[PDB]
């Protein structure tokens, strides 16, 4: 399955002028476009080799539309300030994410479109793509306004049509990078933290896409409660890294096994100390 995702962040700056607007576009776990309101460019820019192909119409259009996004968010900040009766001397944040997922048959699988205000769910399109989830009363006001204007229809038209179309286009053009799978290079490290304890760390490196699962078992018993699991992180070269660690009594190393699951592996991998 594949996905196209657009992310938008607008942060109000009391006194510092107009809000900071940042937009990014992703195909799966690969960014391809960006826009920064504070940049001298004032253009939608390429961030992937395979999007540079697109002609002037593409860039002009996306620039205009993303600027429209910036303006709409800019108004949204004031509107929401009104909804919540908030002061003009505090910074606030509006976030919007939307996009589409296609399945193995490269056809529409899912669609989404959601807004958050100050780190918190504000309004979201439901899975049926024709109703709204509003987390509070203000979001209910928004919901009334969007229902009266039939936003969900146009939105569904975008999600099921244009979004999928351009997703398939991008997937075709950047197939070398987007339609690839890099199996994780796995290993385990052992380092005494004390006379009686040792840190066992299970590593997965150079994998794509980012989805992966690392779990520790002690004599077959899952050890998630006592496992330090870091957030999957980018290597910088388009691949990802992740590790999971457990602190064990020295001498018990052979009881512990690491378990790695990734779509690049023909089957789940088990690493062990013997």
């Amino acid at each position: 399955s594949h996905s196209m995702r657009y992310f938008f962040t607008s942060v109000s700056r009391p006194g510092r002028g107009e809000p900071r607007f940042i937009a990014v576009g992703y195909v799966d776990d690969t960014q391809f476009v960006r826009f920064d309101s504070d940049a001298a460019s004032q253009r939608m820019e390429p961030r992937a080799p395979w999007i540079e192909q697109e002609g002037p119409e593409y860039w002009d259009g996306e620039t205009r539309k993303v600027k429209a996004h910036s303006q709409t968010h800019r108004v949204d900040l004031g509107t929401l300030r009104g909804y919540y009766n908030q002061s003009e001397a505090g910074s606030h944040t509006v976030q919007r994410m939307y996009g589409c997922d296609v399945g193995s048959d490269w056809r529409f699988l899912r669609g989404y479109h959601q807004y958050a205000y100050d780190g918190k769910d504000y309004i979201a399109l439901k899975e049926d793509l024709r109703s709204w989830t509003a987390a509070d009363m203000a979001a209910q006001t928004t919901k009334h306004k969007w229902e009266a204007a039939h936003v969900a229809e146009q939105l569904r038209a975008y999600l099921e049509g244009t979004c999928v179309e351009w997703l398939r286009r991008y997937l075709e053009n950047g197939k070398e990078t987007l339609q690839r799978t890099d199996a994780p290079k796995t290993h385990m490290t052992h380092h005494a933290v004390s006379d009686h304890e040792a840190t066992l760390r299970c590593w997965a490196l150079s994998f794509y896409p980012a989805e992966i699962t690392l779990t520790w078992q002690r004599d077959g018993e899952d050890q998630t409660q006592d496992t330090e699991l870091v957030e999957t992180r980018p290597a910088g070269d388009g691949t990802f890294q992740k590790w999971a660690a457990v602190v064990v009594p020295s001498g018990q190393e052979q009881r512990y096994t690491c378990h790695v699951q990734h779509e690049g592996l023909p089957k789940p991998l088990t690493l062990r100390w013997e």
């Binding site: 657009y6 937009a23 576009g25 593409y58 259009g61 996306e62 539309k65 993303v66 429209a68 996004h69 709409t72 108004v75 949204d76 509107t79 929401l80 909804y83 509006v94 939307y98 807004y115 504000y122 309004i123 928004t142 306004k145 969007w146 204007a149 936003v151 146009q154 939105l155 975008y158 244009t162 979004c163 351009w166």
Partner: peptide, 9 residues
């Protein structure tokens, strides 16, 4: 490409 039809909150 991104969505061209926008509506305020």
């Amino acid at each position: 490409v991104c969505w061209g039809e926008l509506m305020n909150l």
